[PDB]
Amino acid sequence: HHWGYGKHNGPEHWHKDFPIAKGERQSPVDIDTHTAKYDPSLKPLSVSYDQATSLRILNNGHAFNVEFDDSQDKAVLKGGPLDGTYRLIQFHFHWGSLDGQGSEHTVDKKKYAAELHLVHWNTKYGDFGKAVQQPDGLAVLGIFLKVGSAKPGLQKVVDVLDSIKTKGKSADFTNFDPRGLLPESLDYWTYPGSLTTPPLLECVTWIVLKEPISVSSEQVLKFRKLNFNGEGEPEELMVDNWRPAQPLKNRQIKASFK
Ligand SMILES: CC(=O)[C@H]1CC[C@H]2[C@@H]3CC[C@@H]4C[C@H](OS(N)(=O)=O)CC[C@]4(C)[C@H]3CC[C@]12C
Ligand SMILES: [Zn+2]
């Protein structure tokens, strides 16, 4: 009886195995745009993905993960609210059963169709396993998806999903350029939070871009054809793999922009 997103094992149950679920810096949150304070001391984000080397794509039973070779200093996030350098390890998405839900963060209670998470670890902790034990261990770059025009840079991902339909399936996925998933603007909100799935560790500096990317209805429909279950198990479509907004508590959301 492992955690997931259903009625019996979903977000409202997670606290039993992971009591930090009710902690002081949980994610996601609602971003109230009028209360977020412009912080002129925040620096522009530096996203350096020119040398990113993707290796593989995996259905882990909760999402699909595009994993990168992080053996060298290549694909790095720095600047913004961050001290030091954070290395890209993987990205994944959260999405809905319908276009009207799917994002984890919300903006003035607006839910987007999906949300992309590019996950980076602080190089001062040597590897990602050690980094998640630290309050400044990870930086997750969150990007909203709305349904409209297709995102051409997403299509290589969409097309490989047929080969990883079920939990535990992986596929080689080299030479994928994550620059193709970024919006024009790097204006962002930022706050201290957590992983949004178990183990819910309070190790994330969140950086959520204001500008969504547009993806086509057909692109997101293909996400919704994946399965939470393993091959030969009862079919459970991989939809609504999002955690709802959690209490902000004693936190401030800061805006990089006026
Ligand atoms: C406990 C542990 O080993 C950590 C190290 C890296 C973490 C992973 C980093 C990448 C994503 C981040 C993701 O958090 S999120 N949704 O806020 O971006 C939770 C799942 C997973 C697989 C994480 C689960 C817990 C992992 C395996
Ligand atoms: Zn995520």
Short mmCIF file of all heavy atoms in Angstrom, two decimals, residues 60 65 90 92 94 104 117 119 128-129 132-133 138 140 194-199 201 204 206, ligand 1:
data_model
loop_
_atom_site.label_atom_id
_atom_site.label_comp_id
_atom_site.label_asym_id
_atom_site.label_seq_id
_atom_site.Cartn_x
_atom_site.Cartn_y
_atom_site.Cartn_z
N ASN A 60 8.25 6.15 -13.69
CA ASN A 60 8.52 5.69 -12.31
C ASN A 60 7.24 5.35 -11.56
O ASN A 60 7.26 5.14 -10.34
CB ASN A 60 9.39 6.69 -11.54
CG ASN A 60 8.65 7.96 -11.19
OD1 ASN A 60 7.51 8.17 -11.63
ND2 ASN A 60 9.26 8.79 -10.36
N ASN A 65 10.26 10.75 -16.07
CA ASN A 65 11.43 11.53 -15.73
C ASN A 65 12.43 11.51 -16.88
O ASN A 65 12.85 10.41 -17.27
CB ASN A 65 12.13 10.94 -14.52
CG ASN A 65 11.29 10.86 -13.27
OD1 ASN A 65 11.53 9.97 -12.43
ND2 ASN A 65 10.43 11.82 -13.04
N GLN A 90 17.33 16.10 -13.60
CA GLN A 90 16.20 15.54 -14.33
C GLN A 90 15.10 16.56 -14.47
O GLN A 90 15.11 17.58 -13.79
CB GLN A 90 15.67 14.30 -13.62
CG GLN A 90 15.08 14.51 -12.24
CD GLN A 90 13.58 14.43 -12.24
OE1 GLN A 90 12.91 15.38 -12.61
NE2 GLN A 90 13.05 13.28 -11.91
N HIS A 92 10.58 16.56 -15.13
CA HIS A 92 9.33 15.82 -15.19
C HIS A 92 8.21 16.81 -15.16
O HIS A 92 8.43 17.99 -14.99
CB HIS A 92 9.17 14.84 -14.03
CG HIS A 92 9.16 15.51 -12.69
ND1 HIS A 92 10.31 15.87 -12.03
CD2 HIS A 92 8.14 15.99 -11.96
CE1 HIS A 92 9.99 16.52 -10.92
NE2 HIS A 92 8.68 16.60 -10.87
N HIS A 94 3.77 17.40 -14.05
CA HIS A 94 2.53 17.06 -13.37
C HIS A 94 1.40 17.56 -14.26
O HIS A 94 1.52 18.64 -14.84
CB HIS A 94 2.43 17.72 -11.98
CG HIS A 94 3.61 17.47 -11.11
ND1 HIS A 94 3.59 16.55 -10.08
CD2 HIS A 94 4.88 17.94 -11.16
CE1 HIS A 94 4.77 16.53 -9.49
NE2 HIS A 94 5.57 17.35 -10.14
N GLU A 104 0.67 22.22 -10.02
CA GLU A 104 0.85 22.10 -8.57
C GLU A 104 0.80 23.50 -7.95
O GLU A 104 -0.06 23.78 -7.12
CB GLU A 104 2.16 21.39 -8.27
CG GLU A 104 2.12 19.96 -8.76
CD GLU A 104 3.04 19.05 -8.02
OE1 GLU A 104 4.25 19.30 -7.99
OE2 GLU A 104 2.51 18.03 -7.50
N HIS A 117 8.83 20.62 -14.03
CA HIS A 117 9.83 20.79 -12.99
C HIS A 117 11.19 20.37 -13.49
O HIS A 117 11.39 19.19 -13.78
CB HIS A 117 9.44 19.98 -11.76
CG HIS A 117 8.23 20.51 -11.06
ND1 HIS A 117 7.47 19.79 -10.17
CD2 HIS A 117 7.68 21.74 -11.12
CE1 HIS A 117 6.48 20.53 -9.74
NE2 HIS A 117 6.58 21.73 -10.29
N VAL A 119 14.82 19.91 -12.21
CA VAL A 119 15.37 19.69 -10.87
C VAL A 119 16.89 19.79 -10.89
O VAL A 119 17.54 19.09 -11.66
CB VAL A 119 14.92 18.32 -10.33
CG1 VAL A 119 15.48 18.10 -8.94
CG2 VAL A 119 13.40 18.19 -10.33
N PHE A 128 23.31 14.48 -5.44
CA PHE A 128 21.93 14.88 -5.18
C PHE A 128 21.37 14.19 -3.92
O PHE A 128 20.54 14.78 -3.23
CB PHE A 128 20.99 14.71 -6.39
CG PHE A 128 20.89 13.32 -6.95
CD1 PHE A 128 20.12 12.36 -6.32
CD2 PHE A 128 21.52 12.99 -8.15
CE1 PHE A 128 20.00 11.08 -6.85
CE2 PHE A 128 21.43 11.70 -8.68
CZ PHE A 128 20.67 10.74 -8.02
N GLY A 129 21.82 12.97 -3.63
CA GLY A 129 21.38 12.30 -2.43
C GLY A 129 21.75 13.05 -1.17
O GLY A 129 20.97 13.11 -0.23
N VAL A 132 19.64 16.63 -0.94
CA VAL A 132 18.26 16.68 -0.46
C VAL A 132 18.14 16.65 1.07
O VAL A 132 17.06 16.90 1.59
CB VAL A 132 17.35 15.59 -1.07
CG1 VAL A 132 17.27 15.76 -2.59
CG2 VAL A 132 17.79 14.18 -0.67
N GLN A 133 19.26 16.43 1.76
CA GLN A 133 19.29 16.51 3.23
C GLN A 133 19.58 17.91 3.75
O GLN A 133 19.76 18.10 4.95
CB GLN A 133 20.32 15.49 3.78
CG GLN A 133 20.04 14.06 3.35
CD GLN A 133 18.64 13.55 3.73
OE1 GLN A 133 18.10 13.89 4.80
NE2 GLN A 133 18.05 12.71 2.87
N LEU A 138 18.37 21.77 -3.23
CA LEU A 138 17.83 21.72 -4.57
C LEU A 138 17.29 23.07 -5.00
O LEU A 138 16.88 23.87 -4.16
CB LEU A 138 16.70 20.70 -4.67
CG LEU A 138 16.96 19.21 -4.46
CD1 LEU A 138 15.71 18.45 -4.86
CD2 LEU A 138 18.16 18.64 -5.19
N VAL A 140 14.42 23.98 -7.92
CA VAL A 140 13.50 23.46 -8.91
C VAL A 140 12.94 24.65 -9.65
O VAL A 140 12.34 25.57 -9.07
CB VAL A 140 12.38 22.56 -8.34
CG1 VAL A 140 11.55 22.00 -9.47
CG2 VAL A 140 13.00 21.39 -7.57
N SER A 194 9.59 22.56 -0.64
CA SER A 194 9.84 21.13 -0.52
C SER A 194 9.68 20.42 -1.83
O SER A 194 9.12 20.94 -2.80
CB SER A 194 8.83 20.51 0.49
OG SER A 194 7.53 20.44 -0.06
N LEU A 195 10.09 19.15 -1.83
CA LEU A 195 9.62 18.21 -2.87
C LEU A 195 8.13 18.13 -2.75
O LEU A 195 7.57 18.15 -1.64
CB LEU A 195 10.19 16.83 -2.67
CG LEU A 195 11.69 16.68 -2.48
CD1 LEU A 195 12.06 15.22 -2.31
CD2 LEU A 195 12.43 17.30 -3.65
N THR A 196 7.45 18.03 -3.89
CA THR A 196 6.01 17.93 -3.88
C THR A 196 5.48 16.49 -3.88
O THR A 196 4.26 16.29 -3.93
CB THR A 196 5.36 18.68 -5.06
OG1 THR A 196 5.67 18.00 -6.28
CG2 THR A 196 5.78 20.10 -5.09
N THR A 197 6.39 15.50 -3.90
CA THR A 197 5.98 14.09 -3.67
C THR A 197 6.75 13.58 -2.47
O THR A 197 7.80 14.13 -2.13
CB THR A 197 6.30 13.15 -4.88
OG1 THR A 197 7.68 12.77 -4.90
CG2 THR A 197 5.99 13.83 -6.17
N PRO A 198 6.27 12.49 -1.84
CA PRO A 198 7.12 11.82 -0.87
C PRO A 198 8.54 11.63 -1.43
O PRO A 198 8.67 11.25 -2.61
CB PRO A 198 6.38 10.49 -0.67
CG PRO A 198 4.95 10.88 -0.81
CD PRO A 198 4.96 11.85 -1.98
N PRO A 199 9.59 11.82 -0.65
CA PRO A 199 9.54 12.03 0.81
C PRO A 199 9.30 13.46 1.30
O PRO A 199 9.43 13.71 2.50
CB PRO A 199 10.91 11.51 1.27
CG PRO A 199 11.79 11.81 0.10
CD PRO A 199 10.94 11.46 -1.08
N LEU A 201 10.79 16.26 1.23
CA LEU A 201 11.90 16.86 1.96
C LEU A 201 11.93 18.36 1.75
O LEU A 201 11.70 18.87 0.65
CB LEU A 201 13.21 16.24 1.50
CG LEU A 201 13.37 14.75 1.80
CD1 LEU A 201 14.58 14.17 1.07
CD2 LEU A 201 13.43 14.48 3.30
N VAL A 204 14.13 22.55 -1.02
CA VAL A 204 13.99 23.21 -2.32
C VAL A 204 13.88 24.71 -2.22
O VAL A 204 13.04 25.23 -1.50
CB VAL A 204 12.75 22.67 -3.08
CG1 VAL A 204 12.63 23.33 -4.46
CG2 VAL A 204 12.83 21.14 -3.19
N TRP A 206 12.34 27.16 -4.60
CA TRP A 206 11.44 27.15 -5.74
C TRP A 206 11.64 28.40 -6.56
O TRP A 206 11.68 29.49 -6.01
CB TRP A 206 9.97 27.04 -5.32
CG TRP A 206 9.63 25.57 -5.10
CD1 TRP A 206 9.62 24.89 -3.92
CD2 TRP A 206 9.32 24.62 -6.12
NE1 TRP A 206 9.35 23.56 -4.16
CE2 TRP A 206 9.13 23.38 -5.49
CE3 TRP A 206 9.20 24.71 -7.52
CZ2 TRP A 206 8.82 22.24 -6.20
CZ3 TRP A 206 8.87 23.59 -8.21
CH2 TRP A 206 8.68 22.36 -7.55
C1 LIG B 1 15.41 10.71 -1.13
C2 LIG B 1 16.28 10.78 -2.34
O1 LIG B 1 17.14 9.96 -2.59
C3 LIG B 1 16.05 11.92 -3.29
C4 LIG B 1 17.30 12.35 -4.06
C5 LIG B 1 16.80 12.98 -5.37
C6 LIG B 1 15.28 12.96 -5.22
C7 LIG B 1 14.43 13.03 -6.49
C8 LIG B 1 14.77 14.26 -7.32
C9 LIG B 1 13.85 14.37 -8.55
C10 LIG B 1 12.35 14.32 -8.18
C11 LIG B 1 11.94 15.65 -7.52
C12 LIG B 1 10.48 15.65 -7.18
O2 LIG B 1 10.11 16.82 -6.46
S1 LIG B 1 9.37 17.97 -7.20
N1 LIG B 1 7.95 17.38 -7.72
O3 LIG B 1 9.16 18.97 -6.18
O4 LIG B 1 10.19 18.39 -8.30
C13 LIG B 1 10.14 14.49 -6.26
C14 LIG B 1 10.53 13.21 -6.97
C15 LIG B 1 12.01 13.07 -7.33
C16 LIG B 1 12.16 11.79 -8.14
C17 LIG B 1 12.94 13.02 -6.09
C18 LIG B 1 12.55 11.90 -5.10
C19 LIG B 1 13.53 11.84 -3.92
C20 LIG B 1 14.98 11.71 -4.38
C21 LIG B 1 15.22 10.37 -5.14
#
